[PDB]
Amino acid sequence: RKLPETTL
């Protein structure tokens, strides 16, 4: 939860 979130 709320981890590093890369958006592609």
Next chain:
Amino acid sequence: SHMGGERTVTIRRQTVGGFGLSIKGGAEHNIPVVVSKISKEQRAELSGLLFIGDAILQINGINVRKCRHEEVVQVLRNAGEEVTLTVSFLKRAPGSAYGSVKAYTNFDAERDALNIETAIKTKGVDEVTIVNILTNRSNEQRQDIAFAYQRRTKKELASALKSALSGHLETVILGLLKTPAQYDASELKASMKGLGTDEDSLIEIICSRTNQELQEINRVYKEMYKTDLEKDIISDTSGDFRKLMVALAKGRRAEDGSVIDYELIDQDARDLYDAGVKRKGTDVPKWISIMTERSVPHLQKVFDRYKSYSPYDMLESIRKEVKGDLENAFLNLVQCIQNKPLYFADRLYDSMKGKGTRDKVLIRIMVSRSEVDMLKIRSEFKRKYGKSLYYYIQQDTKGDYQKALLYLCGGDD
């Protein structure tokens, strides 16, 4: 961690410049890469095909299960217009159903930190507001509150509450603010602090914690105190008592097997008898090996089968065969194996039955078991003592300290 049935999904690049996806996770966090957000555009295309929480198992036939975060984003970035995903839904493991403290649903860490800041800075300190909030939040939510409080005030929350709160209430609130591993680690350090040892507290934590819990405790202990927990146990304990505690603290007990080994249950029962009541003296290493290495469901059946060979049950046998700290350790361990909720119910009763209160044991159990098995503890307590745990806390404690403990209890029975 429940992995759903595997599924294939085709996603198409959008003219906005991407797939409309957001992902978290990777092999570095030892959990697979998961879908965290699906865009407004892609959701209309993928209605019923892809979901938030889906783990990405394959990309265009490439296995990305054991790949780290950036490795997956590079594949999707260096991909084409269409991409084929092999996915599986990850239903996160649920918590206990038998805890008294649940997670607040409409949780706002910013609003909680603000309300706590207001209560702390109210003339005289509004303890009731502080207790009401922190006892109706899960431990993980309190961690979010502490992070938000520090950003809002430039002051650590636990530091602020140490000056705003006093007495046993402070001990409860500061205890609730630590993670489970931090709380146990710091309680263990306290039991070995300075000369002498609070063996009862060391015994209580080491005998009662599971493999996973002891694993996290051993890690967090070394981070906090820059020494291994095993080394402090060795320096504060001696003889066979030390060996038992060292063995348990490793948290390498056999995990629950799928099949019941009736032949091994019988052989372990005889070896326990042959090592103790049946002979003069005791083969303590045999007792330690069987009671620290076998799984808990197994030892439960071993202790019943033991009664077929021995005139005394395992607990009475321990009392007759060993003495002192070694005896106390074995007695606690067997209770934790046989019925851990009943074990804690009895320790709660012991801390309140007589003159005054052993607040150290009362606070530790109400904090550490609030999200584990407090509902079972309450059930065993009311069954054995005829009155509720709630009732006993009322008669032994007062003030905001009392209200805090009653909240961790969860209600009357």
